């Protein structure tokens, strides 16, 4: 037991002496073991940047700072229409779809129910599989009824 408690006391001091700032004793395996960080978060980069300049209230100072020394960023903002994506369909459950996709008296409903079931099956499908279902349905329609669909 050497240097372990001497490393730990620094972390114990930070939580009481410097609230909000944490410094981890690295480059020393004995001192590094007191508070091991996850390997996914171990992004050690030799940057010239340091955290010491994060002054509290920096936004207040920068706003009152003179506008002359605020050089441009280059970017430029343009509006775009807020797409009125009103949620178009009245959703129905999967257990609901199976029955109405199975009924045989569809003509009495003028095939409204079966087509609605097909639509909501298509709506919940991903773009690739929905498109492939679309081509498949068009193909079987063109195959079975060339008389009605003149192609």
């Amino acid at each position: 037991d050497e240097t372990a408690r001497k490393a730990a006391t620094q972390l114990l001091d930070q939580i009481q002496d410097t609230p909000g700032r944490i410094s981890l004793n690295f480059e020393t395996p004995e001192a590094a073991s007191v508070c091991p960080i996850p390997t996914s978060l171990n992004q050690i980069v030799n940057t010239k940047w340091t955290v010491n300049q994060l002054q509290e209230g920096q936004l207040t100072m920068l706003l009152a700072q003179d506008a002359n020394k605020f050089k441009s960023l280059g970017v430029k903002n343009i509006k775009k229409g807020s797409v009125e994506t009103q949620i178009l369909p009245r959703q129905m459950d999967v257990k609901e779809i199976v029955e109405k996709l199975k009924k045989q008296d569809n003509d009495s409903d003028q095939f409204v129910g079966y087509a609605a079931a097909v639509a909501n099956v298509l709506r919940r499908c991903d773009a690739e599989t929905a498109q492939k279902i679309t081509q498949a349905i068009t193909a079987t329609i063109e195959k079975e009824a060339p008389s009605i669909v003149n192609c």
Binding site: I22, C35, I44, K71, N77, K79, K80, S82, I87
Partner: protein, 383 residues
């Protein structure tokens, strides 16, 4: 007051300890916020072996139905983990300003098409308890029916003056929200913090407006004190949208999930200490605390010994837009005029496409309908 059991996984323990220490340090300047720490969240900036808290917030309630506004002066959601994100947004705005003048001092650097975070700099989120929604189960969410396994991933949302979190699309929730509907007493639905953290992990934390300047920024880790909730927390915020593939600038961040060995969750401030109605938040960019009433999302103050004053919060949509336009004017990046808050957010092409794709993918995967707010919440102009 005292941490325990070093040499274990304790980086999240240090985050918890320093969040509480910073909250208690802010107590001395404003004695009003004593006892708020029941539900506290914070965001830390990490660089190599140096940690710095940049956002701290408190609160576990949201905007009331009859107190909604159309000018964007009210805080719609005042939960601890959301106001922390808003404080982080303000800090990022301050950092953009610092880049405008002092490139070597700021965390940002000039990238290919937008500002890119400096190498080695990362943001970490800490929450006192489990995020509301999927991440926590106490009552009625128990086995007995196999169909409830679907509810372990389905979206959930909050309700004004309601408690807990309720599932979507039962009988009423499969319909758009309307300003004049929430007025006269339709229940306003706000997505749970678990789902909002999922959105943060998918589309980034910077939001739509700040996406104009900077590339997406993601939490490197999310820490929750509550024990043994790590598996469920990971499912709520990352796993259930892992298969999603957003557009090129975005990606689903594999957030590290950590927990603190010493923890407590009995503190829930719901008849636990005094049933606090107001909430507090602190940003490193501003350097001072702020207290808002979650019932109306406004800062309430007194003057000349006789008045009650309603004041918009610094985290409100109007203040964020005003800060945005101030940044643009200061940096001479021309903006269209007139422009509404909705138009400005929709102006970010990449972020809007990613958000639409994410919501559509959530709907398709039978996770739930993302309950958008009425357009009247964001139709106000900015000038």
């Amino acid at each position: 007051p005292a941490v325990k059991f070093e040499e274990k996984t304790t980086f999240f323990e240090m985050l918890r300890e320093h969040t509480y220490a910073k909250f208690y340090e802010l107590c001395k300047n404003n004695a009003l916020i004593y006892g708020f720490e029941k539900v506290i969240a914070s965001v830390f900036l990490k660089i190599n072996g140096n940690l710095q808290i940049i956002a701290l917030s408190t609160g576990n309630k949201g905007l009331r139905g009859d107190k909604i506004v159309n000018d964007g002066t009210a805080l719609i959601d005042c939960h601890a983990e959301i106001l922390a994100r808003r404080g982080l947004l303000r800090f990022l705005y301050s950092e953009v300003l610092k880049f405008s003048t002092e490139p070597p001092n700021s965390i940002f650097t000039k990238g290919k098409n937008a500002l890119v975070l400096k190498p080695g700099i990362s943001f970490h989120l800490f929450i006192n308890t489990a995020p509301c929604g999927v991440a926590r189960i106490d009552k009625k969410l128990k086995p007995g029916t196999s169909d409830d396994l679907q509810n372990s991933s389905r979206l959930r949302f909050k309700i004004d003056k309601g408690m807990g979190t309720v599932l979507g699309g039962a009988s009423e929730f499969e319909a758009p929200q309307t300003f004049d509907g929430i007025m006269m007493g339709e229940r306003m639905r706000t997505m749970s913090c678990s789902d909002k953290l999922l959105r943060a992990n998918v589309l980034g934390v910077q939001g739509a407006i700040l996406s104009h300047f900077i590339d997406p920024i993601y939490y490197s880790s999310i820490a929750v004190a509550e024990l043994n909730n790590a598996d469920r927390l990971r499912k709520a915020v990352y796993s259930r949208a892992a298969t999603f593939k957003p557009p090129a600038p975005f990606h689903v961040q594999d957030v590290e999930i950590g927990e603190c060995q010493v923890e407590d969750t009995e503190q829930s401030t719901s008849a636990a200490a005094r049933s606090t109605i107001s909430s507090m938040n602190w940003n490193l960019a501003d350097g001072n605390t702020e207290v808002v009433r979650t019932s109306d999302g406004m800062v309430h103050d007194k003057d000349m010994s006789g008045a009650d004053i309603t004041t918009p919060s610094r985290l409100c949509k109007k203040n964020m837009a005003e800060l945005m336009i101030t940044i643009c004017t200061l940096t001479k990046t021309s903006v269209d005029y007139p422009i509404s808050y909705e138009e400005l957010k929709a102006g970010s092409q990449e972020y809007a496409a990613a958000k639409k794709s994410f919501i559509t993918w959530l709907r398709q995967k039978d996770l739930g309908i993302w309950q958008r707010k009425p357009r009247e919440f964001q139709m106000f102009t900015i000038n």
